[PDB]
Amino acid sequence: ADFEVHMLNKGKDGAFVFEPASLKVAPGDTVTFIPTDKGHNVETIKGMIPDGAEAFKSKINENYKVTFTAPGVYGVKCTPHYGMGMVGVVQVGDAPANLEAVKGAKNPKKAQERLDAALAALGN
């Protein structure tokens, strides 16, 4: 299955946001990160991906499709806007085995608030 996440200068949640900021997919599914506004990319947050998963980092303004195979929760960020809270979470499969690990990772304050909210929204 093929999902979309938009990268925006502003949204419901404030400035510099992924929409949706939380997404549940199945192993083998894809997500395309879409540059609705210029100046954004997507990068896994180091330390916030499941055992055996590969890190990734797209180019600014790249329409970037990623296939998620390793089950677990993945924290993602926009490289330039991370400190300003531009983050998201993708959960792959049920019963993520790395939830408390991800819940405990340290991030910029504005990013941490949005990560916490995205994790809550996933029912974690």
- Min CB(59)–Cu ion separation in Å: 12
Is the CB of 26 or the CB of 55 nearer to Cu ion?
55
- Min CB(88)–Cu ion separation in Å: 11
Member of 21, 25, 31, 78 binding Cu ion (CB under 5 A): 78
Part of the chain binding Cu ion (CB under 5 A), chosen from 30-38, 51-59, 64-72, 86-94: 86-94
- What DSSP line would sit under 15-81, residue for residue? EEEEESSEEEE-TT-EEEEEESSSS---EEPTT-S-TTPPP-BPPTT--EEEE--S-EEEEEE-TTT
Please state the residue numbers annotated as binding site: 40, 78, 81, 86
From residue 18, give the alpha-carbon distance in Å to each of 7, 84, 100: 5, 12, 22
What is the spatial distance between Cα 4 and Cα 44, in angstroms, rounded to a whole number? 16
Please state the residue numbers annotated as binding site for Cu cation: 40, 78, 81, 86
- Min CB(98)–Cu ion separation in Å: 25
Q: Does residue 40 touch Cu ion according to CB under 5 A? A: yes
Is the CB of 40 or the CB of 110 nearer to Cu ion?
40
Helix (H) or strand (E) holding 111: helix 109-121
- Min CB(124)–Cu ion separation in Å: 24
Is the CB of 8 or the CB of 29 nearer to Cu ion?
8
Print burial letters for 77-94: b (CB count within 10 Å at least 16), e (below 16): bbeebbeebbbbbbbbbe
Site residues (CB under 5 A) for Cu ion?
40, 78, 81, 86
